[PDB]
Amino acid sequence: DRTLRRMRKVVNIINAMEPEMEKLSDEELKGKTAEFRARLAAGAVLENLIPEAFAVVREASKRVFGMRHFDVQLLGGMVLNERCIAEMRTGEGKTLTATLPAYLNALTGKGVHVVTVNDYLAQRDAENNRPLFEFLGLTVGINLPGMPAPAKREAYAADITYGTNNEYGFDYLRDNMAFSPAARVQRKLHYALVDEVDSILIDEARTPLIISGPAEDSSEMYKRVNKIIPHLIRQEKEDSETFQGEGHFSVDEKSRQVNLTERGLVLIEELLVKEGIMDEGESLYSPANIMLMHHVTAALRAHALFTRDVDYIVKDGEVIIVDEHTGRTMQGRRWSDGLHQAVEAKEGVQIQNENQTLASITFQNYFRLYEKLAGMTGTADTEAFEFSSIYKLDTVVVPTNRPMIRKDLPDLVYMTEAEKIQAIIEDIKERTAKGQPVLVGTISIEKSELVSNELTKAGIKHNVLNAKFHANEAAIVAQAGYPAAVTIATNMAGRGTDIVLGGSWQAEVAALENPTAEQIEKIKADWQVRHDAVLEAGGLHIIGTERHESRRIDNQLRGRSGRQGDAGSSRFYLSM
Ligand SMILES: Nc1ncnc2c1ncn2[C@@H]1O[C@H](COP(=O)(O)OP(=O)(O)O)[C@@H](O)[C@H]1O
Ligand SMILES: [Mg+2]
Known part of the structure; x- marks a missing residue:
């Protein structure tokens, strides 16, 4: 070059x-x-x-x-x-x-x-x-x-x-x-x-x-149209041949649907037109003005068919639905056809445009x-x-x-995930015994939890970094080269935080309050022995529980070991 x-x-x-x-x-x-x-x-x-x-x-x-x-x-x-x-x-x-x-x-x-x-x-x-x-x-x-x-x-x-x-x-x-x-x-x-x-x-x-x-932006129609439903009176049946009512709309609890009687269409039409959302002589089934029909049919449904603390709730200014099992309330789910807006608009909370x-x-x-x-x-x-x-x-x-002297050992094959996970654990225990710390990279939270729970059964204290609290996890990572430390991390967790062999004594000093020269000299002199021992024991050892589809990702993992000339090793495990 x-x-x-x-x-x-x-x-x-x-x-x-x-x-x-x-x-x-x-x-x-x-x-x-x-x-x-x-x-x-x-x-x-x-x-x-x-x-x-x-x-x-x-x-x-x-x-x-x-x-x-x-x-x-x-x-x-x-x-x-x-x-x-x-x-x-x-x-x-x-x-x-x-x-x-x-x-x-x-x-x-x-x-x-x-x-x-x-x-x-x-x-x-x-x-x-x-x-x-x-x-x-x-x-x-x-x-x-x-x-x-x-x-x-x-x-x-x-x-x-x-x-x-x-x-x-x-x-x-x-x-x-x-x-x-x-x-x-x-x-x-x-x-x-x-x-x-x-x-x-x-x-x-x-x-x-x-x-x-x-x-x-069609909220003013929702908000304003909502004002008309309070004026409507409900009746028990549709105005059939055998039945007659004195109200503006009915309701099919069985078929869960709302039906509007002719007097209501009069009054709604009167009120629609009246407030300033329609024109005189306008048919409200008119293809010309049919936005309102969906506005009204949704609004009518919102008051008529859906009731608060039964089908939904109004927590934190968001209309939330309730599953038929009555068990739960979703937080992302909405309602189609303007139903949620009308329901939200009826409660007055936070009209949600598309x-x-x-x-x-x-x-x-x-x-x-x-x-x-x-x-x-x-x-x-x-x-x-x-x-x-x-x-x-x-x-x-x-x-x-x-000079980069990390030892990237040959991969290992096993017949089954169980066997791989027992071989990693056997290797963790072995290298711990000698004082060597070990970082275990996974490629998924799911694989992190499985490995973690096998480490727990085996009685092995360890830390799990899932890349959800970068600052906290950064503080754990910085100690992951402490003698016999054992850290699990998904490929995304704790990256960018140097892993010093023997631990970071920087961290130790901040822990103390206004230390003195020979207190700190104590940390420093103790850390050097830790660092010399860990370095003597082969440094940090990387375990890849599996290989990423992209080899570069595995390369980022092993790179966590072997910094600034330190001894270290890595090893990836494979299976069917
Ligand atoms: N020139 C230098 N002399 C001493 N220490 C350094 C120097 N450059 C960087 N460092 C230290 O090296 C550590 C790792 O640096 P970092 O930027 O995290 O590495 P990278 O991002 O390249 O993986 C940090 O603690 C930093 O303070
Ligand atoms: Mg960096």
Whole structure:
């Protein structure tokens, strides 16, 4: 690869500038953003400033985080500034790496969109990265579902923004429906730096974002027409040859249907016309005005055939149905032909127009809108062809910082699921006994629960991450490399949270309240022994309970082991 060779020369140069950066004060270092922007206003192009800008970020990260960008992270940063994907293995530091191109592009003053995969990660990377960006004179926004338009607009106004693919695309659709540009929230789609880019740009590429709403706004007919039914009096039978009534409508409890007598049609017609929904002399069976017939026949049914606390209930301002078994109440179900609306309208609660698609976009089309697009992932090379053909993104495999020595053992076949699950359990117990921790990836909650319950029978304490409380599960995952830890996770659970061998001592320190030097030195000295032992015991061991249809997904699982040169192993189990 010739591209890596050109970029190595810049890495060395950036390295050559470190001594001069170390002399700058925190204020001289902070002024760098303004010195760069003046250059840009006086003839510089962004690419000229790449060395200098990266060296400023690195040295800033030294002082703020205690983290000096590795050479390979400098390489990935340069990739990310071109229209490319940087494949950087799990735990190669993609979050810190992204600060290089995000700093560089934010100088342009047009904003930067960092995309992660879920809301917990967007806020985490923003807040983790925020001290480095504020140290350098930049602001950092966080776009989250449920934020009001002013707050979102402030987050898009910041130098750099974080958010999920869903909420960025939802903002754009909502922006396309604005009546003038003033209501919008986004600026121009300038730079989209997409974390976990195979999840986002490939797996969700074709899945569309949809905003549903009503255009058939026919509530005033429902509400107003409802006013007429209280005026109608009920009678026991239809006005037959043998029977006569003094009322406006009847009812078939047996056949569950409503019949209207001629005087009611008079009065309804009178009242329909009267309030201002009809005309004099109009036939209400008239093909001309037959919307009302459905309005009235639904309204009439709503009062006549359906009764509250019997067929439905009115909790939380939603008309809810009740199953004939009287057992339960559905929460998504509605009623056809305007029946629910009339029923809702009779109770007065929340008239529900029909909802339809009002705006739609695929992430494919969406992320193609940005002027600059880039992406990082631990697993991209296999998808290189659609990255190029769909987005014109080129992929670049980035050397790991240290040598990758994880041992991906051969798969194992068994005749039946029972046997596979007994063999995994036997292997868990074995590796626990030695102190080695084990992460068990599944591809479904169903398979997580089955495995969990076999681990329980076997007396094996373990944790189950189902990807429903990302922040909580993130806290469990960070300890999953504790000696003899046992964690179950579906492919979607706890991704993006480093699993440190021996546990994360960071977590331990926060647990204590105002610790002291030798208390913390206690944690640190204890953790090192844990880490040396776990590393000695083979590190983290991955068990795949089955292989995904897409091998890349299995590759993401095993990648959770073997970070930054650590020992580790993985193994997938198969059966019929
Ligand atoms: N240059 C660095 N020096 C020290 N630690 C780093 C550096 N870069 C990243 N880290 C640490 O590595 C851990 C994993 O980084 P992360 O961004 O989660 O990896 P990835 O997203 O690439 O899988 C984090 O705890 C982070 O603080
Ligand atoms: Mg990550």
